[PDB]
Amino acid sequence: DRSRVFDILSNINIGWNLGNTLDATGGGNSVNAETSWGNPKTTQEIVDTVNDRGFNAIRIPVTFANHLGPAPEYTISADWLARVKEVVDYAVNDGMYIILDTHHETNYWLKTDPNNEAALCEELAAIWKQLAEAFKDYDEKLMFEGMNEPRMAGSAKEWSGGTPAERKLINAMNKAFIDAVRATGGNNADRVLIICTYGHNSDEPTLKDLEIPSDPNIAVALHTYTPYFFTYVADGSYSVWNGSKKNDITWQYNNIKKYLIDKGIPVVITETGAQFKENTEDIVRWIGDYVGTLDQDGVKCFIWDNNIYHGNGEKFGLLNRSLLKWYNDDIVDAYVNHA
Numbered sequence: 001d002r003s004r005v006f007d008i009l010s011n012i013n014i015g016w017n018l019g020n021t022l023d024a025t026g027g028g029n030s031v032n033a034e035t036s037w038g039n040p041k042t043t044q045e046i047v048d049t050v051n052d053r054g055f056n057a058i059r060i061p062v063t064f065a066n067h068l069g070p071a072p073e074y075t076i077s078a079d080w081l082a083r084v085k086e087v088v089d090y091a092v093n094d095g096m097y098i099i100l101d102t103h104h105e106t107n108y109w110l111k112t113d114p115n116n117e118a119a120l121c122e123e124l125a126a127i128w129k130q131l132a133e134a135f136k137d138y139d140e141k142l143m144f145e146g147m148n149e150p151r152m153a154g155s156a157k158e159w160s161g162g163t164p165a166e167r168k169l170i171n172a173m174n175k176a177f178i179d180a181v182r183a184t185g186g187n188n189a190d191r192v193l194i195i196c197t198y199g200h201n202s203d204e205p206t207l208k209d210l211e212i213p214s215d216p217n218i219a220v221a222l223h224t225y226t227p228y229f230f231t232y233v234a235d236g237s238y239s240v241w242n243g244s245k246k247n248d249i250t251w252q253y254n255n256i257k258k259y260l261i262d263k264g265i266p267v268v269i270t271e272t273g274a275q276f277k278e279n280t281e282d283i284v285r286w287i288g289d290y291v292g293t294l295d296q297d298g299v300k301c302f303i304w305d306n307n308i309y310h311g312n313g314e315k316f317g318l319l320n321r322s323l324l325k326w327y328n329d330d331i332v333d334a335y336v337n338h339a
């Protein structure tokens with residue numbers, strides 16, 4: 001019976017990622033990593049704005065790698081831990097629902113080599129122990145997401161669910177994450193712990209191989225920027241949404257139902273969104289089909305927002321952080337009013 005996770009999650013309207021921020025990897029062992037990819041230092045005002053618009057839930061991606069001491073302790077540098085805590089606290093002050101993850105660890109130590117299971121499991125555990133300790137007293141609105149898109153970068157199946165041996169590794173790493181957090185006690189004993197598939201992929205073979213922990217206070221995370229060719233820019237990508245491709249979303253959702261929802265397993269889309277391609281009207285329609293699909297079973301999603309809209313890059317930006325204004329209110333309206 002996993003109904004406690006469902007009740008907690010049902011309180012979310014819809015979520016928002018503080019993207020390209022604490023996940024950013026410049027600056028080395030320093031708090032400047034936060035601004036290394038060109039975003040301003042996060043403020044209470046920024047979080048207020050996110051919450052006030054209707055995003056009562058927030059994902060705070062954090063890349064810890066460069067702020068970790070040497071193995072085997074992997075001590076998180078105090079300055080970095082304190083800063084992460086500050087940013088989390090912004091959301092706590094606003095009584096928001098919060099996901100804390102580890103993020104671009106995949107650039108560093110998190111390489112899904114089955115033969116290195118122990119070392120990977122131990123490092124993940126050593127990081128989450130310290131995090132779980134630092135957030136021991138935080139209430140049930142704070143959730144942990146162990147990994148972000150855990151995978152072997154450059155591998156043939158990097159972005160399509162990895163290999164069978166890798167997926168078994170993921171199951172072991174998921175288990176190590178849960179184990180380390182539960183062992184810290186306090187509010188971490190029944191805290192919602194959000195696990196993931198290889199690369200956060202949601203294809204049937206990726207889902208089929210997913211070991212579901214017996215721990216009843218967990219949820220499964222997936223990333224679905226579906227369809228890829230609408231949401232991203234690439235050879236073969238399009239910006240028109242007439243509804244013809246709704247099937248690609250429908251098809252994928254049924255697998256998620258088949259393997260998770262219809263077994264009573266909580267599911268969360270911890271990342272989704274569409275890059276701006278001068279196509280407000282189309283994205284609004286896509287949001288209707290996509291989020292409306294998730295709303296069929298009360299599944300919540302968190303929108304990726306990297307604060308890139310005018311300039312070059314992947315245009316997932318929605319909140320102009322420096323002006324505390326939204327880049328595109330029609331798109332945002334569709335998100336926050338999805339119900």
Ligand SMILES: OC[C@H]1O[C@@H](O[C@H]2[C@H](O)[C@@H](O)[C@H](O[C@H]3[C@H](O)[C@@H](O)[C@@H](O)O[C@@H]3CO)O[C@@H]2CO)[C@H](O)[C@@H](O)[C@@H]1O
Pocket residue numbers: 149159199200223225228
């Ligand atoms: O999963 C989120 C992740 O997506 C990354 O893009 C991946 C896509 O996930 C994947 O669907 C796509 O597959 C396409 C392939 O790369 C193309 O070359 C072409 O052959 O068609 C495929 C569609 O079946 O690959 C991309 C490659 O990046 C994003 O990079 C990343 O931001 C995000 O986290």
Ligand SMILES: [Mg+2]
Pocket residue numbers: 186187
């Ligand atoms: Mg308690």
